[PDB]
Design a protein around this ligand. Sequence first.
Ligand code: HEM
Length: 153
Amino acid sequence: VLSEGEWQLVLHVWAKVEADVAGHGQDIYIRLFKSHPETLEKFDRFKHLKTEAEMKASEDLKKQGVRVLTALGAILKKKGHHEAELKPLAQSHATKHKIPIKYLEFISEAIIHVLHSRHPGNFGADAQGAMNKALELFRKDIAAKYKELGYQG
Ligand code: HEM
């Protein structure tokens, strides 16, 4: 469980993401796909993209990263009281998309990397620790839901 102060460090960097969620989503996907190329294979609509240039030029990938980061932002704004938001996300990710916990760890690492590069004003050591705690909570709670749903993760 995160303290209020830790949540405020999470929300204060998220406020900067929200100046341009689409651009942050593009940087996070490009980071994820370059660092862990196997993750791109889970996206039927995007697995043909061959280069960072193609990923940046994809209007559909840009829209997807706005949907993904906005869903994450809604979770983080609940400050751990995210049961309702996790239910549909867990169900789709366990049963339709089949996204292992290790891949949620990879996207968490990409989110952290991008915030570290873009936002040193709001993403010093303490703020990064708070964001990691929040992402670790998310992944713990998703993994519990996965198990209830029948998926190993
Ligand atoms: C912070 C973690 C993540 C969040 C908040 C998130 C959120 C979302 C949301 C809101 C959608 C659309 C609704 C739905 O189908 O549930 C979606 C779709 C999808 N997500 Fe996730 N996602 C996350 C991580 C991942 C990761 C790591 C992968 C794969 C490695 C993944 C694969 C997919 C796929 C394949 C779809 C369908 C994409 C399409 O329509 O073309 N997601 N995600």
